[PDB]
Structure 1
Amino acid sequence: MKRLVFISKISEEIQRIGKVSIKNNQRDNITGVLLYLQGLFFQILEGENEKVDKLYKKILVDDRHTNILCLKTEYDITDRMFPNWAMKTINLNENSELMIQPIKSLLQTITQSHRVLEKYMPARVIYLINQGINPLTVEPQLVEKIIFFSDILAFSTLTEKLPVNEVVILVNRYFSICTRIISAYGGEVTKFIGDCVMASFTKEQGDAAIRTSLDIISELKQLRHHVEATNPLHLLYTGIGLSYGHVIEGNMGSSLKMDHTLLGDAVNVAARLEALTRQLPYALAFTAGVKKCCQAQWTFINLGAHQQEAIEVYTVNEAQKYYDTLQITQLIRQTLE
């Protein structure tokens, strides 16, 4: 058998949910409980492994709730936790009694706090937590990654002139755009380094990594002529480095502070290729290793060898600029005065 636990955010209607679960959970011989408290669901489900999983994939796509996080998975259990409840619904709001109110209030406060912490988490950890894996004890492994690096053109002159709030508005907008597109193509964001976005793709995701690069460049171009001139967003440009190689993926740090990152020379290479694009007529630079993972009929352009042994640099025709890097940089400064 098998048992999992998840939480989710909602979007008499819950009564239609439990009427169903009961019938289907006997049809497939399942038990568990559904709690509702302050617009959040909590569910425990237990039963034969194939039957419990056929159900939770159905649950994942139910549009009655969002931001689903599976906290816990127990494999090959032997004793059910609620053998007599096909699916028991406990509306924790209807309960007004004294002795459940403390536990009611704490469940609310921990889970809400929890939901806030989730947004500062490494995507990989949240993924591990969903798959039942313990992030703190997982063993760091050597994996093959495409490494992605993007940051803001002449950002230090954007921070130089704008007031703090426009800086933040601008950085957050940049980060929204980057992560939405990376995540849509199947990449994972590793972390933010100042103005920089570090991500990874798999070795079957070369095309998706170039497409990600071009799309970001594209949305920033549209964004610049969508807004008025006096909007700092009018001044937002990026350059993107891709590398490929082996990296160590895992957790690092002491008891008092943990991080779940990627170590390996390819990390440095993508960052240097990213910075290389400030001297290139292209916004995207990548290695030959990235090119090998690319199946699509890209028009690859060779930018020669660069720097402790030199490496070959490539780009695609679609990453060409219609601007000069020191032109944009003096233009940014002239605008802000």
Structure 2
Amino acid sequence: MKRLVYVSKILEEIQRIGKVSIKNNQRDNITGVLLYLQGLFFQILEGENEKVDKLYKKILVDDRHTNILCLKTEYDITDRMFPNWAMKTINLNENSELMIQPIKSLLQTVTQSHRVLEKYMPARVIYLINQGINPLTVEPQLVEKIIFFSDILAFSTLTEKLPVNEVVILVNRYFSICTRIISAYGGEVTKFIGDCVMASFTKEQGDAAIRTSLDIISELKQLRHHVEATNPLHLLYTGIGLSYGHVIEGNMGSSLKMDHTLLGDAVNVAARLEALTRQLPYALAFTAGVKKCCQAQWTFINLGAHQVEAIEVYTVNEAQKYYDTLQITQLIRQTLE
């Protein structure tokens, strides 16, 4: 016996939604409550985990509501909380009971506020919250991750020369492209550090980490020729570093400020392979360890030993640079002056 609680973003159709959920939840044996307030849903679903989930999956696929977040989960509950309500839909906008108006006010406010904060949250925290887990309570673990670093090439020159607002548009589009792909491929972005994107994949995701990289590179290449030469995006290039090692993962800091962080040498090895791509005919570089997390039959190029005790460095064929790198930063420089 389990129970989840989620919030999402969305009159007669609502009634239809409700009638159908009572009959199926009556069949499935799970009971719950559903609340609607000013474009916001809340829903609790409790029972045998079997189709708590399967019901949930159907809810996720449905097109009406959107931006679904599972706020909490609970396993092994001695009791149910709503034992006789297959689904009790509560439209709260027309409940104008006086001593209830204050609570609707607070619920709306903290919720909308909540949904803003959700945008700043590291994706591993948001994940933990789905699984019903207090990220403040999880003990950090030591895990073998693939670590991903990428930044924008010659970013000090674009900053030196573009107006501030062009610089934002450029970074924003870089982070947008980087996040979507990394996320699509199973990865998790840890944070932005300046222009740099940091992320990590599991050890079963070697192939996805290379594909991710290759997709970033490729998407920025397409953007460069889709825009006009007056567009700064025309100048956006990246380099990508990947390492593989053990890292303490988890939530750290104090009650005053927390962060989700990875600690370990491999983080720094990845940063410096990223920085090394500036001197190489490839925009992606990575270690023997990443090489071993891969199942696809890549064509691996030994780039040689680089110190950072020395570490052998590898890339794949598909990452060859069709350009000369330090020529580009001379390109960027001329262009912007």
Same fold per TM (> 0.5)?
Answer: yes
Residues 64-111 of structure 1 deviation map (CA, whole Å, 9 limit, x = unaligned)? 211111111122112222222111111112223322211111110000
* C-alpha deviation, 1:49, in angstroms: 2.6
SS in 2 for 1:99: helix
TM-score normalised per structure 1: 0.97
Say whether the 8 Å CA contact 1:11–1:65 is kept in structure 2. Answer: no
Say whether the 8 Å CA contact 1:249–1:261 is kept in structure 2. Answer: yes
Alignment-derived partner of residue 146 in structure 1: 146
TM-score normalised per structure 2: 0.97
Q: Which shifted more, 38-47 or 238-247?
A: 38-47
SS in 1 for 2:204: coil
* C-alpha deviation, 1:11, in angstroms: 13
SS in 2 for 1:85: coil
Q: 1:11 to 1:192 in 2, by over 3 A?
A: farther
* C-alpha deviation, 1:316, in angstroms: 0.8
Residues 172-200 of structure 1 deviation map (CA, whole Å, 9 limit, x = unaligned)? 00000001111111111011000000011
* C-alpha deviation, 1:331, in angstroms: 0.9
Say whether the 8 Å CA contact 1:274–1:284 is kept in structure 2. Answer: yes
Say whether the 8 Å CA contact 2:2–2:77 is kept in structure 1. Answer: yes
Say whether the 8 Å CA contact 1:206–1:293 is kept in structure 2. Answer: yes
Q: 1:297 to 1:170 in 2, by over 3 A?
A: same
Residues 190-234 of structure 1 deviation map (CA, whole Å, 9 limit, x = unaligned)? 110000000111111111111111111111111001000011101
- Runs (5+) with no aligned partner, structure 1: none
* C-alpha deviation, 1:270, in angstroms: 0.6
Residues 35-83 of structure 1 deviation map (CA, whole Å, 9 limit, x = unaligned)? 0111111011122232422322222222221111111112211222222
SS in 2 for 1:246: strand
Residues 255-275 of structure 1 deviation map (CA, whole Å, 9 limit, x = unaligned)? 100011111111000100000
Say whether the 8 Å CA contact 2:5–2:45 is kept in structure 1. Answer: yes
Q: 1:308 to 1:183 in 2, by over 3 A?
A: closer
**Aligned-partner Cα distance in 1 for 2:331–2:6:** 51
**Aligned-partner Cα distance in 2 for 1:19–1:169:** 47
Please report the RMSD computed on the Cα atoms of aligned residues, expressed in angstroms: 1.3
SS in 2 for 1:166: helix
Q: Which shifted more, 239-248 or 76-85?
A: 76-85
Provide the aligned length of Structure 1 versus Structure 2. Answer: 337
**Aligned-partner Cα distance in 2 for 1:327–1:11:** 61
**Aligned-partner Cα distance in 1 for 2:319–2:120:** 32
SS in 2 for 1:204: helix
SS in 2 for 1:148: strand
**Aligned-partner Cα distance in 2 for 1:252–1:92:** 39
Residues 19-49 of structure 1 deviation map (CA, whole Å, 9 limit, x = unaligned)? 0110111112222210011111101112223
Q: Which shifted more, 279-288 or 318-327?
A: 318-327
Say whether the 8 Å CA contact 1:162–1:336 is kept in structure 2. Answer: yes
SS in 2 for 1:304: strand
SS in 1 for 2:146: strand
- Runs (5+) with no aligned partner, structure 2: none
* C-alpha deviation, 1:308, in angstroms: 5.2
Q: Which shifted more, 314-323 or 43-52?
A: 43-52
Say whether the 8 Å CA contact 1:11–1:66 is kept in structure 2. Answer: no
